[PDB]
Design a protein around this ligand. Sequence first.
Ligand SMILES: Nc1nc2c(ncn2COCCO)c(=O)[nH]1
Ligand SMILES: Nc1nc2c(ncn2COCCO)c(=O)[nH]1
Lengths: 112, 110
Amino acid sequence: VTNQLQYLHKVVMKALWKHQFAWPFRQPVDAVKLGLPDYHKIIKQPMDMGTIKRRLENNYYWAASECMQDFNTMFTNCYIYNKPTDDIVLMAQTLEKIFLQKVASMPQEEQE
Amino acid sequence: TNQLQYLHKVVMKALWKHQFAWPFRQPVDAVKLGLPDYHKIIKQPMDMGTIKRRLENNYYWAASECMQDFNTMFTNCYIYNKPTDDIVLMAQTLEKIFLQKVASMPQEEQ
Ligand SMILES: Nc1nc2c(ncn2COCCO)c(=O)[nH]1
Ligand SMILES: Nc1nc2c(ncn2COCCO)c(=O)[nH]1
């Protein structure tokens, strides 16, 4: 497995998964459960930490950059769809700041 | 530091020249662009011109802190604009390059 995907699993996902703001992102947006009949109109590429976490457990990723894009798509989905004033937006912002400051310490290069 | 230099000369380099970069090279001008609610909604304006100047003037103490400014700039765009505005596509494209360039950053400190 890659040095960088190992960092993404054990440092980034470990931090973000147990975070007190993580729960709205731990599973796919369920448009029916949440009452969002336009969600899949607006968000064409849904993403969530459950999917990323399993994808790290199943070595589905080839490069770290593609794990990073899933994280980024997840947060971007949230800012695009939700209202500027929704608490979910500031939860995503808080989680994204951690993702970014962890990524600033990720190795370079590749392995495996 | 080595990482700030990389963010200056590799990351900011690539993004500045990009064909979608022009809305992001200078602060949003809410009055010229016709957006009287822009500052009611975005409380932390940010833009690559401000980030470039801060890197030239040694404003940043750490890499993560310049990376946060890049993120704020993109997030502002996503939060303020309608999902279908082209500028959202432009920010996503730029942000993807940003993440990919950041993954190859020297891991140290300097
Ligand atoms: N579904 C749901 N779970 C929550 C809420 N607050 C905390 N949790 C549990 O997740 C926190 C991590 O254990 C909440 O408001 N709703
Ligand atoms: N109430 C609540 N909002 C959520 C949840 N998951 C997603 N959202 C709404 O944000 C969608 C952004 O892509 C969740 O389980 N709790």
